[PDB]
């Protein structure tokens, strides 16, 4: 299907914090982020450890624990017909554009078990868990007026922040990776100049 492009900014601490809040409240009910720790999310998002424990750790876990959830994969697979996959790496499995289009493409479909279908993910087993915010979206997708807390722009911002947090979760090293790679490439150009000059000198 045709995806909607979203510009994900991994330096936006506020956007990533809002996305982490949305993930902890609306997504950790069924999805784990078990491959990342609350402590590292707090450190990378600029969230104080006490604030992270108070505001985003609902499972009773420690700050250094993986973002596990009570819903076991087998039970969830039985209940929904499909297991809610761990979302730590979903931004790498699907990409941020796919996630952005998917979380905004839920529409009402009575023939489906959960009363919804998805344009990006047809016959998906996800219930439309963000319906309270977006509102009632029906088929071209249109939101029924006065059915959600947020308007189209506000819900788009919410989904963008959530997808930004997911993108960070999939690749928590991206910013440090760029910072280190800049210096590595500078040193390698510096060393290349010397190696090339040495080769030129010897090959006379």
């Amino acid at each position: 299907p045709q995806l909607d492009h979203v510009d994900i900014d991994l330096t936006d601490k506020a956007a990533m914090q809002d996305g982490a809040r949305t993930f902890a409240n609306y997504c950790m009910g069924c999805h784990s982020a078990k491959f990342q720790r609350y402590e590292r999310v707090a450190t990378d998002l600029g969230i104080p450890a006490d604030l992270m424990m108070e505001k985003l750790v609902f499972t009773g876990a420690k700050i250094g624990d993986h973002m596990d959830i009570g819903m076991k994969p087998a039970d969830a697979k039985t209940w929904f017909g499909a297991a809610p996959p761990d979302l730590t790496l979903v931004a790498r499995v699907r990409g941020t554009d796919w996630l952005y289009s998917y979380l905004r493409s839920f529409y009402e479909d009575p023939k489906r078990p959960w009363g919804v279908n998805n344009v990006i993910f047809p016959n998906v087993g996800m219930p439309n868990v963000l319906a309270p915010l977006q509102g009632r979206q029906v088929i071209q997708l249109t939101v029924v007026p006065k059915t959600g807390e947020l308007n189209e722009a506000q819900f788009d911002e919410k989904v963008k922040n959530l997808v930004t947090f997911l993108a960070y979760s999939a690749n928590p090293n991206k910013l440090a990776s760029e910072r280190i790679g800049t210096y590595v490439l500078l040193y390698l150009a510096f060393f290349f100049v010397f190696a090339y000059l040495l080769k030129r000198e010897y090959w006379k």
Partner: peptide, 16 residues
Amino acid sequence: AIAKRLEPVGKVCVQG
């Protein structure tokens, strides 16, 4: 600022 940004969605009314 961050505390408001991270406020849990679920609000609970409590006696007193």
